[PDB]
Motif scaffolding. Structure first.
Motif, mmCIF file in Angstrom:
data_model
loop_
_atom_site.group_PDB
_atom_site.id
_atom_site.type_symbol
_atom_site.label_atom_id
_atom_site.label_comp_id
_atom_site.label_asym_id
_atom_site.label_seq_id
_atom_site.Cartn_x
_atom_site.Cartn_y
_atom_site.Cartn_z
ATOM 1 N N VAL A 6 13.275 -0.501 7.638
ATOM 2 C CA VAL A 6 12.860 0.551 8.567
ATOM 3 C C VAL A 6 11.753 1.414 7.941
ATOM 4 O O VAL A 6 10.778 1.731 8.632
ATOM 5 C CB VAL A 6 14.056 1.407 9.064
ATOM 6 C CG1 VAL A 6 13.632 2.343 10.177
ATOM 7 C CG2 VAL A 6 15.191 0.530 9.552
ATOM 8 N N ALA A 7 11.899 1.767 6.634
ATOM 9 C CA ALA A 7 10.950 2.588 5.876
ATOM 10 C C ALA A 7 9.583 1.943 5.844
ATOM 11 O O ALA A 7 8.615 2.606 6.197
ATOM 12 C CB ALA A 7 11.459 2.827 4.460
ATOM 13 N N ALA A 8 9.509 0.637 5.483
ATOM 14 C CA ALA A 8 8.261 -0.137 5.400
ATOM 15 C C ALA A 8 7.579 -0.222 6.756
ATOM 16 O O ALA A 8 6.388 0.058 6.848
ATOM 17 C CB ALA A 8 8.530 -1.533 4.849
ATOM 18 N N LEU A 9 8.351 -0.554 7.807
ATOM 19 C CA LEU A 9 7.903 -0.656 9.193
ATOM 20 C C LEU A 9 7.324 0.649 9.728
ATOM 21 O O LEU A 9 6.257 0.623 10.332
ATOM 22 C CB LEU A 9 9.079 -1.052 10.095
ATOM 23 C CG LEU A 9 9.573 -2.464 9.999
ATOM 24 C CD1 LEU A 9 10.859 -2.615 10.727
ATOM 25 C CD2 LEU A 9 8.529 -3.444 10.481
ATOM 26 N N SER A 10 8.041 1.771 9.550
ATOM 27 C CA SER A 10 7.658 3.075 10.083
ATOM 28 C C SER A 10 6.660 3.862 9.236
ATOM 29 O O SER A 10 6.110 4.859 9.711
ATOM 30 C CB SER A 10 8.902 3.915 10.367
ATOM 31 O OG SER A 10 9.697 4.108 9.207
ATOM 32 N N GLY A 11 6.435 3.421 8.005
ATOM 33 C CA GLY A 11 5.526 4.087 7.078
ATOM 34 C C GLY A 11 6.058 5.428 6.611
ATOM 35 O O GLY A 11 5.326 6.424 6.583
ATOM 36 N N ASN A 12 7.364 5.466 6.299
ATOM 37 C CA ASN A 12 8.053 6.669 5.836
ATOM 38 C C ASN A 12 8.955 6.337 4.660
ATOM 39 O O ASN A 12 9.160 5.163 4.345
ATOM 40 C CB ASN A 12 8.835 7.352 6.976
ATOM 41 C CG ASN A 12 7.988 7.728 8.178
ATOM 42 O OD1 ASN A 12 6.930 8.382 8.067
ATOM 43 N ND2 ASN A 12 8.424 7.295 9.358
ATOM 44 N N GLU A 13 9.447 7.360 3.973
ATOM 45 C CA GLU A 13 10.313 7.126 2.835
ATOM 46 C C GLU A 13 11.749 7.194 3.327
ATOM 47 O O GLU A 13 12.109 8.111 4.073
ATOM 48 C CB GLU A 13 10.051 8.176 1.750
ATOM 49 C CG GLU A 13 10.426 7.752 0.342
ATOM 50 C CD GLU A 13 10.001 8.771 -0.700
ATOM 51 O OE1 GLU A 13 10.518 9.913 -0.663
ATOM 52 O OE2 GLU A 13 9.128 8.437 -1.534
ATOM 53 N N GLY A 14 12.538 6.198 2.949
ATOM 54 C CA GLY A 14 13.949 6.118 3.294
ATOM 55 C C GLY A 14 14.763 7.061 2.437
ATOM 56 O O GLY A 14 14.584 7.102 1.215
ATOM 57 N N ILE A 29 0.807 -1.233 0.000
ATOM 58 C CA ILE A 29 0.000 0.000 0.000
ATOM 59 C C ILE A 29 0.846 1.291 0.000
ATOM 60 O O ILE A 29 0.538 2.221 -0.768
ATOM 61 C CB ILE A 29 -1.066 -0.015 1.150
ATOM 62 C CG1 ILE A 29 -1.959 -1.282 1.133
ATOM 63 C CG2 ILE A 29 -1.896 1.273 1.212
ATOM 64 C CD1 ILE A 29 -2.765 -1.578 -0.190
ATOM 65 N N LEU A 30 1.867 1.350 0.885
ATOM 66 C CA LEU A 30 2.779 2.476 1.084
ATOM 67 C C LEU A 30 3.534 2.829 -0.202
ATOM 68 O O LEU A 30 3.746 3.999 -0.499
ATOM 69 C CB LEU A 30 3.770 2.091 2.222
ATOM 70 C CG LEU A 30 4.842 3.085 2.720
ATOM 71 C CD1 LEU A 30 4.217 4.234 3.486
ATOM 72 C CD2 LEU A 30 5.818 2.386 3.649
ATOM 73 N N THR A 31 3.913 1.814 -0.962
ATOM 74 C CA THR A 31 4.697 1.931 -2.177
ATOM 75 C C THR A 31 3.838 1.915 -3.443
ATOM 76 O O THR A 31 4.370 1.999 -4.553
ATOM 77 C CB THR A 31 5.689 0.822 -2.121
ATOM 78 O OG1 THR A 31 6.455 0.994 -0.940
ATOM 79 C CG2 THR A 31 6.560 0.792 -3.256
ATOM 80 N N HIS A 32 2.506 1.825 -3.286
ATOM 81 C CA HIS A 32 1.612 1.818 -4.431
ATOM 82 C C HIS A 32 1.518 3.182 -5.079
ATOM 83 O O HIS A 32 1.328 4.190 -4.393
ATOM 84 C CB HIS A 32 0.223 1.270 -4.091
ATOM 85 C CG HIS A 32 -0.703 1.303 -5.268
ATOM 86 N ND1 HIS A 32 -1.905 2.001 -5.225
ATOM 87 C CD2 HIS A 32 -0.525 0.822 -6.521
ATOM 88 C CE1 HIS A 32 -2.443 1.861 -6.424
ATOM 89 N NE2 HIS A 32 -1.642 1.178 -7.244
#
Ligand SMILES: [Mg+2]
Ligand SMILES: [Zn+2]
Ligand SMILES: [Zn+2]
Ligand SMILES: [Zn+2]
Lengths: 65, 141, 49, 133, 114, 43, 85, 559, 168, 159, 196, 263
Positions: free
Chosen positions: K54-62, A50-53
DNA sequence: CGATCGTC
RNA sequence: AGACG
């Protein structure tokens, strides 16, 4: 390009969550990580889904026919 | 207003450039062992400063995450390959009659980005996916 | 998202690749090989704009 | 047949040189004021500290595919704690009346210096090592 | 374009029988069974149970190539024990263990709320 | 595409080499392997 | 003329790998073309495996003309040549 | 060149190559689609008539089938089209162009083919999927990897031609190379890495696993070896189970450094009757080394046996490691806080040594030694100091790396990585160079416009103090880029030049052959050598051996 | 001392030792004559060239000069008895093993020896990483190496880049 | 320079000695200088060794040089291979290059040489001087589409 | 390929079960080799993964931008805060057995690229087909059903092997071969082919 | 009750957290595998496209259609078409779905899994109803339409297992941990300073006592007690993922036993 | 008068 | 020409 139905890695249905995610951000003012977790996307493989969609469908419907 | 200026290699010859604005020209009078080693000042008679050292790179290299932590030929290799990758090359792909077109079903914006990708419109037209990957000896296949 | 900068010649998108040449009207001195009687040479590749 | 060697040793050193399951043991015979031993031991299943007094035994019996212990009615020469099977690889003479014997226990090395057991330790793929207390 | 059908993983194709029992050449009272259209789910499960049998001298399984969904099971038993019987007992022993588990889960499940 | 539209060609002492003067001007990384290595540049 | 007689033959009494391979090749080609087999068969069906048996049981009726650099040659039967390798 | 020496051919195939842990050394994995395309003319004999009619009945699209049927008069019957396709009543003497079947000899090649080993006969194994599969231990003669490489397959059309492949070109025969009088194939990657790990004195396996590993060895005698440990667990050592893959009658002795018959470091190597007595199995034992298990096995047991050996070793090791696992993280590049302190100050004293020598040069006190410039000596000094700096810092890192360090482990096995790798990744990248010298003043009197004129400081002339872990600075970055580019240019030049050399070398010695009088002559019969290589010995059957009379004291010779 | 030579004598000895179950505790059944004359006969029996004339006879003797040096050094009376502890049965086996293995080690007429040599040099030349030698840290160590040097050699280049003289 | 020298006690001992390296060549003149060891004087210029010391000395130096190129890279190639290469350049009496100037001018077959370089002109002077092609060469039979006298084709097989 | 000059092909496809797995139930979409790392010295690849996890886990862009102050330590502090061993390592269980792997796997997300030129676009096989007009030699290309090149370079390998007939076959039976008539006197292609 | 034991920690319509005590690891795994791969479900396995004036490709759409979860409650009373004696498909072996959508509104129209219509005769069984867990009541977004945009298609949903295609996965993610203290020494931790400090403790540590430092290694000890968390995609309820899991595996073991009687 | 290999 | 090892 439309959210994929189901997460590639685990298969947890993610198709019913976009409309909801978009709302959680725009209306609820919430940040992605909390929004993601609120949709019950606990594992990081589902999160990336979802985040990367990139929802290129919206752009494609802007073409006239 | 002349806050910025256009310099060619010929004029470059007569000027002294700072790399970072702050980190290259404030004052003097403990540290982070993790952070890389930058020199000092020594040269202080500055005439210009770099807008951002990452601007030394071009389109292909501006896509690489942390090239400053990679062996130089690998950064050159990636540059060649990114041009062989698939994804949405244009939004109107459905409308063009062109010899060969490869479009990714579900392209994803990378979790690891470069400030330069904002201009390169990469997150808006990506060329890959954020695959969950294990570095491992499995079946040996 | 299209950037332009190309042509369309008989329906084909055409890029004109930047062509690197040595700049004209520059004076440049060069030494010369061991057999040659001329030890050094001054050259100018004069051109009209 | 039967036993080929039996003795009580005193452990001088216990070294875990780059290992966490194995330890090379340095020990000398309590009785025999010349007899020595060098041996790799699995400290995980059988630990050994400094100055320990262990009964070292070299036998030849208790050929063919291995059958699991099966305590169903079985009985081996075991009244010991540590048991090992291995091969003879070198019989070295450390001058005139001093001999050394070399046994590998699947890579766990073993050396025994003295002279007493001449006609006892012969060139064999056979050899069981038995340790107690 | 050279990809075999996915049904070929769990579907026997005309001429293929499930089990193939071939007597072992190297050992006495030892046998090799070719399980067709089967993997690690059945291989490891049966091989582990066969080991729990005291009369079983040997039990090992292998999957010679990931492309093909078949495995081999080598069984060696004590004299007066047909390796086929050992395999049978193992299977029954598995089902009994499974049955027990099915009931237990249901019992626990029906005690739960939400 | 963006990359193609930012390419350089050098026909014909050390042109294949990344000269110091390229700093901030031409990309230090991006060049074809073998054939025309350092003759094909990118801004 | 030219030749070399059986007595006085300097060439290796052992069959070369190349001699072997060509022998097995020529023989397998004959067997493959319904030519008679000079040996018994152990349910054997492969022309090369059959030729190998015929060689192993020295029943290949062929001769090797070993040309020397001048042009002279030494004729050696498959039967006489030692097949160690 | 393009029509006589070489040409385009029939009965050939090409595709992307993939690796197969489950393929025999001499086998080749052929896609069923390709197998169905390529044929072999086979005459109808009473030995094959039954199989041939059957294959004709299977036809061109079902696998073990045929494409054409040729009879007397020389007329091809196209099985995919003919109306009598399923009516063919075979006659002896007729040829049946059958599909490529299992165990057929096929010529396998990788381009550029600058070797007899770049072209070897393989046993066909018809498999699904679109890639050609090969055993990893056949990778090096071909100089192949799986990053996208493609290979060429040729099918002999004659019985004698297929004999020539199996009897001369066959992969097992090619094991011990005459090029360097050592094997040209060994144990690599996962297998080389896992074999070290399996071999360790600490490595103990138990029944459940032991039995699986035993069964995995195809040749296995069915005899469970007696465990090294019979105490509170029957525990087999890694060495034990691996020796099961080694055949009997195999003797190997080595001695590395501290190696003394009681091998305290578990080093060197001793194998007796095919049982590994002591020593960790790494590249020296199991690589394409001179006195290797492979060189020994090919010599003692034979090619066919040694070929099987690669398979047996592979099978056990791959299996054990599939269940042990192996990975490499970023953590493997992280060296201790205290280690980092020493690395940092090591480079600091190098920087001073340079600075002081500079101060000396500028003072005119520097005296250049005969044959070189005052500046030539200075640069030689600075470069020396700076290389020493990188080397000490790298050695400081290596030392701090634990035996659990995945990179350290790969180096120890000999599968991947060298010192410099550890050093540049985790301690210091070091000095950069173009045309042998350190970064030149491209700009007037300066390397870059961020520097002042006439700056000879390490930092100024391309010294990368930082490790890849810490990251490189823009200056360091550009300088490393200048060096990198130089590499690429002469990589591209080397490929071009060496290729030309190779053709000339080949054209010049084409016709040089060993004649029937052990003489080495050409096409005119001119003598090049009287005895080949001055001994009339074949290179493949030669080994480095100690001449016991040449060395030692006059006293020790006598004794 | 270490030189590539046919027949790994060491391996044969170890093979005799294991096969015949040699015990370094029993005295051998050999003779000074058995060893001395045995090793001497084996020498006459190592064939490369078979011709009986003096030219070819000397050619043959010269071809096995170095290998016999190896053979003697290894199969010396003191070594056969004190070191190896061979028996007549085991020693005779060693002698016939060497003979057979040596004859096996001989080159086969027809070997395309020229193409082999060309590829044998060509392949490693291809693998040559850098034209820049590892002497590029010291100023008084610059000597044209690698692929350029190899080119200078093969072309019989009149004007070489680093003409050097070494004075002892 | 480091030297492996036998000590009076028998063993070889590392005995370091002074050696002079030179930019330039004049072998003839330098070797007659007093204080030097004329038995030991070397040059990387094999052609100069060939001129002053002879063909066999040249051959030795020529190998030594080829050897050093491979050795420097770390790599090892069996002696016989480079031996053969060197012997080939050497057998003509002088030094014959591995180019269209050295071996492609040699008394070999017209078709076997027109396979390398100068293809057409090699075939012209073959027709001009009216050369007879031996066909005993590899390259000739390759053109002719015949089983060449190579390994398998080196001998004839009869009944 | 990864975004670090790391090109490689599929060797095999495994389904979810046979794949190694996390105690969380996560499984890789890809398995890359540990050996692809030492020699290559592509540390950024490893760093990308750490950051991306870390990016995926925290919901932020690395932020993987070059000349910055982002440290492997800074990333590690954030990842551990998320409950994972700071250096990307994770305990993995064997998919075939359920047994924990003795080794811990560097696991996490990494941006990978699908590249052009796929097996099927490359597979060629030709057991006889079209012959070029002038040369009477097999055609050039997959699209034409062309003959693979057995160059002079290839020819040389077969000479080294001493495989005389295979070489004769490759250059005749497969590819070319033609029956011509020559005069015994002049030795030229003068003889008129007047067959039957 | 004998042998294997269960202890449910957490339970919901979507997840089961439980402890599988008194079982073998081989069994724990075989079960974990079978839950993933071998429980049969009902998924769309054929799409006939009548009209497609959408931004997306027919196959792209068709692919997502297979991904939509459908009710598989009474799946055993539905035949695999490969076993059915019909010509192609029928009601004994398949469920037929309809999807017809047109962009009437100027604004963008969404196509949901609620928009699928069972046209087939169900013969009274909880089968094929698209799974809807979305709060608003429209689980899964098939695609989007603009104006003249139209999507008319027909779906044949069939019985199958994940081993054939991941779309037939009843499961999702299965959490699986045993011996959370590494008392068994089944893994060797990668550390720098302290394995204990560097590696985080699992939730499962509370359910087991620590090893107690000065204790000798338990050589003979084996793995029993596995902390599992079975997540359902919704096609089949959670109890059923596990129950059919046990059942499927039980059936295949019975199959072998049966094939021994056949010989 | 030479100038790596395969392929679209 | 262009792309790949
Ligand atoms: Mg490659
Ligand atoms: Zn997921
Ligand atoms: Zn005429
Ligand atoms: Zn039906």
């Amino acid at each position: 390009m439309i959210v994929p139905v189901r997460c590639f890695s685990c298969g947890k249905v993610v198709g019913d969550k976009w409309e909801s995610y978009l709302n959680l951000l725009q209306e609820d003012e919430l940040d992605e990580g909390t929004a993601l977790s609120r949709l019950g996307l606990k594992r990081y493989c589902c999160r990336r889904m979802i985040l990367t969609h990139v929802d290129l469908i919206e752009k494609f419907l802007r073409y006239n026919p | 207003e002349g806050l910025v200026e256009y310099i060619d290699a010929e004029e470059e010859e007569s000027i002294l450039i700072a790399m970072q604005p702050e980190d290259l020209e404030p004052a003097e009078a403990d540290v982070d062992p993790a952070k890389r080693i930058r020199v000092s000042h020594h040269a202080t008679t500055f005439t210009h400063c770099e807008i951002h050292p990452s601007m030394i790179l071009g389109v292909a290299a501006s896509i690489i995450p942390f090239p400053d932590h990679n062996q130089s030929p690998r950064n050159t290799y990636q540059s060649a390959m990114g041009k062989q990758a698939m994804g949405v090359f244009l939004t109107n792909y459905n409308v063009r009659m062109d010899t060969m077109a490869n479009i990714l079903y579900y392209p994803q914006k990378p979790l690891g980005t470069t400030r330069a990708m904002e201009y390169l419109k990469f997150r808006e037209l990506p060329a890959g996916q954020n695959a969950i990957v294990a570095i491992a000896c499995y079946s040996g296949y | 998202f299209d950037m332009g900068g190309y042509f369309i010649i008989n329906g084909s998108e055409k890029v004109l690749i930047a062509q690197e040449r040595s700049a004209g009207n520059i004076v440049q001195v060069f030494k010369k090989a061991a057999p040659s009687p001329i030890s050094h040479v001054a050259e100018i590749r004069s051109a009209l704009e | 047949s039967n036993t080929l060697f039996d003795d009580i040793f005193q452990v001088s050193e216990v070294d875990p040189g780059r290992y966490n399951k194995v330890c090379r043991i340095e020990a000398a015979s309590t009785t025999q004021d010349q007899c020595k031993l060098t041996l790799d031991i699995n400290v995980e299943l059988f630990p050994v500290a400094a100055q320990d007094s262990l009964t070292v035994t070299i036998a030849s019996s208790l050929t063919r595919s291995w059958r699991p212990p099966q305590a169903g009615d079985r009985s081996l020469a075991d009244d010991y704690d540590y048991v090992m099977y291995g091969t003879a690889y070198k019989f070295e003479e450390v001058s005139k009346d001093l001999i050394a014997v070399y046994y590998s226990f699947g890579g766990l090395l073993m050396r025994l210096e003295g002279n007493y057991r001449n006609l006892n330790n012969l060139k064999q793929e056979n050899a069981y090592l038995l340790i107690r207390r | 374009m050279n990809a075999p059908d996915r049904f070929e993983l769990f579907l026997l194709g005309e001429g293929e029988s499930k089990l193939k029992i071939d007597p072992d050449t190297k050992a006495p009272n030892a046998v090799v069974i070719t399980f067709e259209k089967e993997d690690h789910t059945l291989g490891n499960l049966i091989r582990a149970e066969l080991l729990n049998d005291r009369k079983v001298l040997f039990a090992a399984y292998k999957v010679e190539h990931p492309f093909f969904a078949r495995f081999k099971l080598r069984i060696q038993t004590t004299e007066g024990y047909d390796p086929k019987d050992a395999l049978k007992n193992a299977c029954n022993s598995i089902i009994n263990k499974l049955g027990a588990l099915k009931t237990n889960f249901e019992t626990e499940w029906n005690l739960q709320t939400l | 595409t963006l990359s193609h539209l930012r390419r350089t060609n050098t026909p014909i002492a050390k042109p294949r080499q990344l000269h110091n003067t390229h700093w901030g001007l031409v990309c230090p990384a991006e060049t074809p392997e073998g054939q025309a290595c350092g003759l094909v540049k990118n801004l | 003329e030219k030749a070399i007689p059986k007595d006085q033959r300097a060439t290796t009494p052992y069959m070369t790998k190349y001699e072997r391979a060509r022998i097995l090749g020529t023989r397998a080609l004959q067997i493959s073309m319904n030519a008679p087999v000079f040996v018994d068969l152990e349910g054997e069906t492969d022309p090369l495996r059959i030729a190998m048996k015929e060689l192993a049981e020295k029943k290949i009726p062929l001769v090797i003309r070993r040309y020397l650099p001048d042009g002279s040659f030494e004729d050696w039967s498959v039967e006489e040549l030692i097949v160690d390798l | 060149r393009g029509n006589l020496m070489g040409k385009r051919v029939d009965f050939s195939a090409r595709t992307v190559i993939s690796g197969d842990p489950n393929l025999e050394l001499d086998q080749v994995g052929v896609p069923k689609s390709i197998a169905k395309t390529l044929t072999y003319p086979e005459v109808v004999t009473p030995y094959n008539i039954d199989r041939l009619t059957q294959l004709v009945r299977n036809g061109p699209n079902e696998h073990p089938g045929a494409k054409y049927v040729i009879r007397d008069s020389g007329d091809r019957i196209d099985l995919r089209y003919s109306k009598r396709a399923g009516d063919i009543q075979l006659q002896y003497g007729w040829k049946v162009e059958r599909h490529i079947m299992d165990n057929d000899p096929v010529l396998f090649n990788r381009q550029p083919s600058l070797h007899k080993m770049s072209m070897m006969a393989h046993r066909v194994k018809v498999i699904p999927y679109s890639t050609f599969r090969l055993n990893l231990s056949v990778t090096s003669p071909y100089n192949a990897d799986f990053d996208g490489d493609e290979m060429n397959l040729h099918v002999p059309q004659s019985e004698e031609t297929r004999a020539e492949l199996s009897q001369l070109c066959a992969v097992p025969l090619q094991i011990v190379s005459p090029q360097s009088n050592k094997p040209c194939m060994g144990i690599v990657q996962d297998t080389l890495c896992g074999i070290r790990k399996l071999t360790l004195r600490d490595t103990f396996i138990e029944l459940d696993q032991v039995l699986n590993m035993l069964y995995w060895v195809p040749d296995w005698d069915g005899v469970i070896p007696t465990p090294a440990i019979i105490k509170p667990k029957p525990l087999w050592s890694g060495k034990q189970i691996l020796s099961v893959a080694i055949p009997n009658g195999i003797h190997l002795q080595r001695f590395d450094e501290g190696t003394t018959l009681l091998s305290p470091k578990d080093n060197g190597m001793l194998i007796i009757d095919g049982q590994i007595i002591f020593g960790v199995v790494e590249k020296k034992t199991v690589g394409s080394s001179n006195g290797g298990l492979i060189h020994v096995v090919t010599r003692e047991k034979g090619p066919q046996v040694c070929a099987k050996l690669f398979g047996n070793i592979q099978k056990v090791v791959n299996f054990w490691l599939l269940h042990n696992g192996f990975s490499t993280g970023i953590g493997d590049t992280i060296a201790d806080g205290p280690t980092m302190r020493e690395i940092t100050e090591t480079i600091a004293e190098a920087k001073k040594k340079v600075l002081d020598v500079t101060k000396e040069a500028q003072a005119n006190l520097l005296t250049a030694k005969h044959g070189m410039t005052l500046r030539e000596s200075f640069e030689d000094n600075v470069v020396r100091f700076l290389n020493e700096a990188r080397d000490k810092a790298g050695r400081l890192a290596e030392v701090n790396l634990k035996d659990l360090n995945n990179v350290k482990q790969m180096v120890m096995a000999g599968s991947k990585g060298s010192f410099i790798n550890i050093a540049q990744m985790s301690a210091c990248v070091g000095q950069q160079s173009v045309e042998g010298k350190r970064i030149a003043f491209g700009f007037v009197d300066r390397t870059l416009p961020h520097f002042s004129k006439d700056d000879y400081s390490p930092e100024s002339k391309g010294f990368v103090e930082n490790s890849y872990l810490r990251g490189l600075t823009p200056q360091e970055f550009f300088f490393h880029a200048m060096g990198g580019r130089e590499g690429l240019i002469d990589t591209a030049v080397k490929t071009a030049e060496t290729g030309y050399i190779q053709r000339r070398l080949v054209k010049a010695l084409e016709d040089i052959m060993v004649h029937y009088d052990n003489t080495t002559r050409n096409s005119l019969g001119n003598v090049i050598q009287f005895i080949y290589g001055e001994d009339g010995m074949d290179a493949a059957h030669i080994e480095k051996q100690s001449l016991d009379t040449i060395g030692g004291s006059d006293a020790a010779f006598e004794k | 001392a270490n030189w590539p030579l046919p027949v790994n004598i060491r391996r044969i000895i170890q093979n005799a030792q294991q096969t015949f179950h040699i015990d370094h505790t029993k005295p051998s059944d050999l003779t000074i004559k058995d060893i001395v004359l045995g090793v001497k006969d084996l020498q006459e029996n190592l064939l490369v060239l078979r011709g009986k004339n003096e030219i070819i006879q000397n050619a043959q003797r010269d071809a096995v000069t170095l290998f016999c040096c190896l053979l003697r050094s290894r199969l010396a009376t003191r070594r056969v008895l004190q070191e190896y502890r061979l028996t007549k049965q085991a020693f005779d086996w060693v002698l016939s093993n060497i003979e057979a293995q040596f004859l096996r080690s001989v080159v086969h007429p027809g070997e395309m020896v020229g193409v082999l040599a060309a590829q044998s040099i060509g392949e490693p030349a291809t693998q040559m990483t850098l034209n820049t030698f590892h002497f590029a840290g010291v100023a008084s160590k610059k000597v044209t190496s690698g692929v350029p040097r190899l080119k200078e050699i093969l072309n019989v280049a009149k004007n070489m880049k680093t003409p050097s003289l070494t004075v002892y | 320079y480091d030297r492996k020298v036998p000590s009076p006690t028998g063993e070889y001992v590392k005995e370091p000695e002074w050696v002079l390296e030179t930019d330039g060549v004049n072998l003839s003149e330098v070797m007659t200088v007093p204080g030097i060891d004329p038995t030991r004087i070397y040059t990387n210029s094999f052609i100069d060794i060939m001129e002053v010391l002879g063909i066999e000395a040249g051959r030795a130096a020529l190998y030594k040089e080829v050897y050093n190129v491979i050795a420097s890279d770390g790599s090892y190639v069996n002696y016989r291979h480079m031996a053969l290469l060197v012997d080939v350049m050497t057998t003509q009496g002088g030094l014959t290059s591995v180019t269209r100037h050295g071996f492609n001018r040699s008394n070999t077959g017209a078709l076997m040489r027109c396979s390398f370089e100068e293809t057409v002109e090699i075939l012209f002077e073959a027709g001009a001087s009216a050369e007879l092609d031996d066909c005993r060469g590899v390259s000739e039979n390759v053109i002719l589409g015949q089983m060449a006298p190579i390994g398998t084709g080196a001998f004839d097989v009869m009944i | 390929a990864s975004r670090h000059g790391q090109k490689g092909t599929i060797g095999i496809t495994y389904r979810r079960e046979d794949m190694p797995f996390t105690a969380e139930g996560i499984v890789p979409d890809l398995i890359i080799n540990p050996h692809a790392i030492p020699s290559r010295m592509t540390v950024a690849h490893l760093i990308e993964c750490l950051l991306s996890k870390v990016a995926a886990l925290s919901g932020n862009e690395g932020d993987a931008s070059p000349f910055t102050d982002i440290t492997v330590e800074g990333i590690s502090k954030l990842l551990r805060e998320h409950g994972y061993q700071s250096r990307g390592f994770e305990v993995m269980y064997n998919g075939h057995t359920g047994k924990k792997l003795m080794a811990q796997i560097f696991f996490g997300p990494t941006y990978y690229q699908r590249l052009r030129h796929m097996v099927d676009d490359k597979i060629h096989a030709r057991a006889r087909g079209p012959m070029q007009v002038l040369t009477r030699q097999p055609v050039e290309g997959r699209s034409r059903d062309g003959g693979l090149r057995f160059g002079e370079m290839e020819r040389d390998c077969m000479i080294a092997h001493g495989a005389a007939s295979f070489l004769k076959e490759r250059l005749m039976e497969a590819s070319d071969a033609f029956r011509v008539h020559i005069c015994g006197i002049c030795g030229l292609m003068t003889v008129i082919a007047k067959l039957n | 009750e004998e042998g294997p034991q269960v202890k449910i920690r957490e339970a919901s319509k979507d997840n089961v957290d439980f402890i599988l005590s008194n079982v073998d690891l081989a069994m724990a795994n075989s079960l974990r595998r079978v839950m993933i791969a071998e429980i049969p479900t009902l998924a769309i396995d054929s799409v006939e496209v009548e009209t497609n004036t959408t931004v997306l490709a027919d196959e792209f759409i068709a692919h997502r259609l297979g991904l939509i979860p459908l009710q598989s409650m009474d799946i055993e009373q539905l035949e695999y078409s490969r076993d059915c004696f019909c010509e192609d498909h029928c009601d004994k072996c398949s469920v037929v779905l309809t999807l017809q959508a047109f962009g009437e509104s100027e604004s963008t129209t969404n196509v949901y899994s609620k928009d699928l219509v069972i046209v087939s005769n169900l013969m009274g069984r909880n089968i094929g109803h698209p799974i809807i867990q979305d709060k608003e009541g429209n689980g899964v977004l098939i695609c989007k339409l603009r104006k003249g945009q139209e999507l008319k298609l027909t779906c044949v949903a069939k019985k199958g297992i994940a081993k054939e295609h991941a779309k037939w996965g009843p499961a999702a993610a299965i959490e699986f941990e045993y011996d959370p203290w590494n008392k068994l020494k089944h893994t060797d931790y990668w550390y720098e300073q302290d394995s204990a400090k560097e590696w985080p403790q699992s939730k499962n540590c509370e359910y087991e006592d620590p090893p107690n430092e000065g204790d000798p290694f338990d050589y003979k000890a084996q793995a029993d007690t596995f902390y599992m968390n079975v997540e359902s995609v919704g096609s089949i309820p959670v109890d059923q993922v596990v129950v059919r899991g046990i059942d499927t595996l039980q059936k295949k073991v019975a199959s072998i036993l049966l094939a021994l009687t056949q010989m």
